Symmetry: C3
Subunit: 334 residues, 3 copies
């Protein structure tokens, strides 16, 4: 019975980081308490100044990643401030019943609610807003993120041997549908409500204007690149709440990958490219063996390089000539 | 030798139901006999009165699901009445040889044929019409369904333990390509033949005008919702003969899923969203634990809510506060 | 240490063939040496005379398949003749570090370089050109192929039992983005450089004008059909460096399939249709049981029959009435 369990309180952190947590643990089940506050805002999503009338959990795309263990109960307080214009809610794919909790968390601006559900299944799961009649709009405008439910004894390989990560990053990939006017320029809307009708028209074409990691072209590049060192294992959590994507690490691999994102299933190894189904979150482990700047992208290379679905990981350490060596540098042909 | 085996005769039923059958069985192999009659007809596919010049097996989209056991022989009589305008045939993905049987079942209006093949592989398999030179048109106009070949000893989990369903539903998802005229309204064609050239032009854009379960927007919603009770296991058979989709049960999961649809492979568990490749049928088991109305949809939410790829399952029984509880209902913020 | 190993030299062959190689082998690791020469050229890609300003490894789309064993080192010499206009390089998904080798193989026209990397992971892996700032263009214009890294003891089934192929074919599937002018005809460009800006515009729509196997509509059909005999096992290597596809053998199956293409993972059996993620190569084994002409295609049937993604395999041998029999030929209805 959940009433008798100890309660713990978790402080969320902004993507691409993930809040401190244990993997394998000796702890018994808890009611883990989180709070998120919805923020509607206009956001600049590319280098040329295009805006999106956006909607977010906790001010970021994606929302923050919530982490518990299998057997825990998630208890979320969802706050919709009066400064917002729209009603909202939350649908946890990791939860059982009531349209993922959507039916029990309908909050108008100035309202809040508290949902509890049992995280009885391990994996990365999408959570997203789902107000009746406007579900796709809320999702594609930015209202999604990941619940990671770790097995109580940590991750396991196909033979039941222990797996771990030394650092976790969360990447949300957003297919955006920004309208254009008669002049072929992207439209800038004074309010969220005014963007709706034009946006639905773009949505129905099924062609994104932009596809971005973490809310904007270049969000995870240059100074905002992910980081690691040779010998460190990274978990890359990839969520896509609306559309398929195909993650790849250039110069790397998915050492162990759960592309459907459910940890009770054996992972696949040595992947070049994996597949996240629209409406899901997946997870890949990789241990870096070479230093340098890696690209982490959607391997529809148009979607990556033209439309925005690409980032970087800057990796420190010592080059390894056994794994790779320039035998003869570029030089004239004999 | 198939000539020495007992023959049985099966009466098909309309989707979303599936005809009575055994899962695990003590029976030896049989020649199982079915008959289907092709019906070309104009069908209303949405709420605003849009029509499709459709083609069907047995008058429905999808065609009915045929169920046998591994080692059985399927013996289909395919009837093409003289009231039809086009030639037709059938390609069983579950069969070996002759383009799935297409080469041996070419039937002009007023003709019929009888095909036999050995169902030597377990799984859900697409069957579809495939006349030379017009294959995509016949498929996207509605001529597909599922052959389910159960293992003789029933479904099994990754550890070889028994799995079962208490009820089976079949869902066919149809990407439609309805042309529009200069006024931006959908075209209404007097005959099947007249729809062809305009439709091929829409097809080549790769953008469906509509994507529907079972032949129309809302076919599996409201009064036509699927049904179940808490404690019952449902098999959800999902076919898509032309285009990828990503099934999800809102507030539920795929407890055991064969997304490529082939039962000799271990299923995956705890899926939020699975993937049916265009040209295949997949299958998911789920045991309901909460009552209420669930949505079962393609989790490209545009494809679902805007274009039509969504239905409902109405589930009876007792709410379970351990799995989910509204701790604090929506109420003003402190 | 790679310097102490024996060097071997391999002569590449044109797709759809694959160069002679061993599967299971008693040989220890080698440094296997290959050379490829880039050729930019205009190519006719369909029946109506449409051209593509193409870019290739070794004059073909796809490039040739390179085959080694796990533990070998690949040592490629990449030649960019002075007759080419653009700089190029190579990114091996099978390699670790330096953006797959791209950073160490930047070659202007008239230059060459030699890369070595350790093929420490078994599977089929994409290789492709990846010049900074122009990656998608080089890829979609034809610069990709497959590195197959076989396990030293050959392929294995889920229970660790031996698998083999008697013949291997390599199929590269290319989503092309050919621009049109104001008259609705495809544009013909005098040079590679001139095609760029118009092509990027088509790319950004995400709608291919054509999707072809091995560089052109019908490349693997009629006289250029693949061949086999009843009782022979074929390996079908399928690469797609930019966009998803869904291979299917009409009248056949994937007997054992590694759709993510990584041989240390158990294969799936009895597949009707499998899924190659954009940015990957997959592999399927099939043993023919019936003679006749099979179609091997992308089972988005529009992509196959309308846009070009389909070929044929002509199979010799004796028909098998147990697997399939025309019980009653097409004939009038009673
Ligand atoms: O593997 N570079 O897209
Ligand atoms: O999980 N609701 O799309
Ligand atoms: O299975 N014929 O597309
Ligand atoms: Cu919302
Ligand atoms: Cu959802
Ligand atoms: Cu037909
Ligand atoms: Cu088919
Ligand atoms: Cu190049
Ligand atoms: Cu790549
Ligand atoms: Zn915990
Ligand atoms: Zn570590
Ligand atoms: Zn039977
Ligand atoms: Zn039951
Ligand atoms: Zn070798
Ligand atoms: Zn053999």
């Amino acid at each position: 019975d959940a009433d008798k369990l100890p309660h713990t309180k978790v402080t969320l952190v902004a993507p691409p980081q993930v809040h401190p947590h244990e993997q394998a643990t000796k702890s018994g089940p808890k009611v883990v308490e989180f709070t998120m506050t919805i923020e509607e805002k206009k956001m600049v999503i590319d280098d040329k100044g295009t805006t999106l009338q956006a909607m977010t959990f906790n001010g970021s795309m994606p929302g923050p990643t919530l982490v518990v263990h299998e057997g825990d109960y998630v208890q979320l307080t969802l706050v919709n401030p009066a400064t917002n214009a729209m009603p909202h809610n939350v649908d946890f794919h990791g939860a059982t019943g009531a349209l993922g909790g959507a039916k029990l968390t309908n909050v108008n601006p100035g309202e809040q609610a508290t949902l509890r559900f049992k995280a009885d299944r391990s994996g990365t799961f999408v959570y997203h807003c789902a107000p009746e009649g406007m579900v796709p709009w809320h999702v594609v405008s930015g209202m999604s993120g990941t619940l990671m439910v770790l097995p109580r004894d940590g991750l396991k390989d196909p033979q039941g041997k222990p797996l771990h990560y030394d650092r976790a990053y969360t990447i949300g990939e957003f297919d955006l549908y920004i309208p254009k006017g008669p002049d072929g320029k992207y439209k800038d809307y004074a309010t969220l409500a005014e963007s709706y009708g034009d946006t639905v028209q773009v949505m129905r074409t099924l062609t994104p204007s932009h596809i971005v990691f973490n809310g904007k072209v270049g969000a995870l590049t240059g100074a905002n690149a992910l980081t690691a060192k040779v010998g460190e294992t990274v978990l890359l959590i990839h969520s896509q709440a609306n559309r398929d994507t195909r993650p790849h690490l250039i110069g790397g691999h998915g050492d162990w990958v759960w592309e459907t994102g459910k940890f009770a299933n054996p992972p696949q190894r040595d992947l070049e490219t994996w597949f996240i189904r629209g409406g899901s979150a997946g997870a890949a482990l990789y241990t870096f063996k070479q230093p340098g700047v890696y690209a982490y992208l959607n391997h529809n290379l148009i979607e990556a390089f033209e439309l925005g679905a690409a980032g970087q990981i800057k990796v420190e350490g010592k080059w390894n000539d056994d794994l790779m060596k320039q035998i003869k540098a570029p030089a004239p042909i004999p």
